């Protein structure tokens, strides 16, 4: 699987890093280039793919 | 090696709100015989019961008693738990486990899992099985020289294990520390050294070669073993 994803805001490949704070059940995805940050709830089954997913979904929902 | 699981018939986690009255009449009577007076603190007690039933057959086979098992529980967990047991003259062997105040039921489940496997009542770890037999071949019999000056073979009991704990076994009381050996040559090297492993490797190779009745001159075996041990460590032929 992939842990570094392309940022939906600046389109920089592999510029997004994902941090899984399991103790607080929160995943934080941050772009290194444009410094955009997003926080989502996560479960023990969650992965950086699902944090990256929740971010894309939040973007598309907010852009409606 | 003997864990608790090897001597238990079954387990069960009940919900006994008060030890004064339990869910089984036998257990209630025995406990209230035990619960005559406050030998404890009532506040620091949980209602979650963990009842363990042992096999009289296995315990007798190992000459184990619920006192030793309870002492092992105390050693491995401490006074933070509460283990009580009935007399051995009862119909069944039973012991009850509680905790002094994750959930308590899930915690009891975790304790029961660990108690069955990790906790050891008897024996040495890594030794899974032991066979006891009287040898009929002179290679394992005790050979002595009588006062008349003759070689005499005495039949004696010897034990054969499935694992190897050579250092621990050698230190056990009534175990011969001169003859007790292993077929695992790396353990021999670790415990006894390089000359010992030289000799043991020679013996194992001789056993393998001569099992068929075939014979190879000693100097070839000696040269191989010397080649494998001359540098102070075990040199594999690889």
């Amino acid at each position: 699987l992939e842990t570094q994803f392309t940022c939906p805001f600046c389109n920089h490949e592999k510029s997004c890093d994902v941090k899984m704070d399991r103790a607080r059940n929160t995943g934080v995805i941050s772009c290194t280039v444009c410094l955009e940050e997003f926080q989502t709830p996560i479960t023990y089954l969650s992965e950086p793919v699902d944090v990256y997913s929740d971010w894309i979904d939040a973007c598309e929902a907010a852009n409606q | 090696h003997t864990t608790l699981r090897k001597v238990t018939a079954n387990t069960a986690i009940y919900y006994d709100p008060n030890p004064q009255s339990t869910v089984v009449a036998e257990d209630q009577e025995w406990v209230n015989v035990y619960y005559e007076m406050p030998d404890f603190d009532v506040a620091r007690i949980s209602p979650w019961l963990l009842r363990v039933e042992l096999d009289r057959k296995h315990m007798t086979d190992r000459k184990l008693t619920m006192e030793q098992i309870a002492e092992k529980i105390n050693a491995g967990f401490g006074d933070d738990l509460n283990c009580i047991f009935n007399d051995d003259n009862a119909e069944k062997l039973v012991l009850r486990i509680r905790i002094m105040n994750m959930d308590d039921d899930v915690f009891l489940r975790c304790i029961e899992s660990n108690m069955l496997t990790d906790m050891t009542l008897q024996g040495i770890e890594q030794i899974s099985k032991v066979y006891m037999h009287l040898p009929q071949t002179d290679n394992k019999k005790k050979i002595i020289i009588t006062e008349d000056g003759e070689f005499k073979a005495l039949q004696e009991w010897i034990l054969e294990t499935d694992g190897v704990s050579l250092m621990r076994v050698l230190s056990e009381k009534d175990v011969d520390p001169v003859r007790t050996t292993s077929n695992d040559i790396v353990e021999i090297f670790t415990v006894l050294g390089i000359e010992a492993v030289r000799k043991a490797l020679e013996r194992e190779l001789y056993h393998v070669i001569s099992f068929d009745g075939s014979y190879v001159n000693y100097r070839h075996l000696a040269l191989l073993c010397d080649t494998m041990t001359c540098r102070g460590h075990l040199m594999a032929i690889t």
Binding site: - | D138, I143, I145, F151, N217, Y218
Partner: protein, 101 residues
């Protein structure tokens, strides 16, 4: 003393060993070559046996040299064969069993 040493070397009762010179067959060959009659007394002085065995033992060397290291190594290298030789070429055996001249 050789017997005690052997008891140490072979703590079991296994007397079967692998050694260079088949002494029993050599004694049998000597008996046949020189037409030894076992039923008559021999002319072999028992002291001749002891001295002869000593010289022979001196004559077969695996580690040569006169220093103490060489002497001990030579003693060790031929210890088993020398025990066998002394227990086969005894004066008692030579006199009452092999009857060599």
């Amino acid at each position: 003393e050789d017997r005690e040493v052997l008891r140490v070397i072979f703590p079991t009762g296994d007397s079967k060993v692998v050694l260079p010179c088949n002494l029993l067959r050599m004694i049998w060959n000597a008996q046949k070559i020189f037409h030894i009659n076992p039923r008559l007394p021999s002319d072999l002085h028992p002291i001749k046996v002891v001295e002869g065995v000593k010289e022979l033992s001196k004559k077969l060397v695996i580690v040569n040299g006169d220093d103490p290291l060489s002497r001990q190594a030579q003693e060790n290298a031929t210890l088993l064969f020398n025990i066998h030789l002394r227990s086969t070429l005894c004066s008692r055996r030579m006199a009452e069993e092999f009857r060599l001249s």
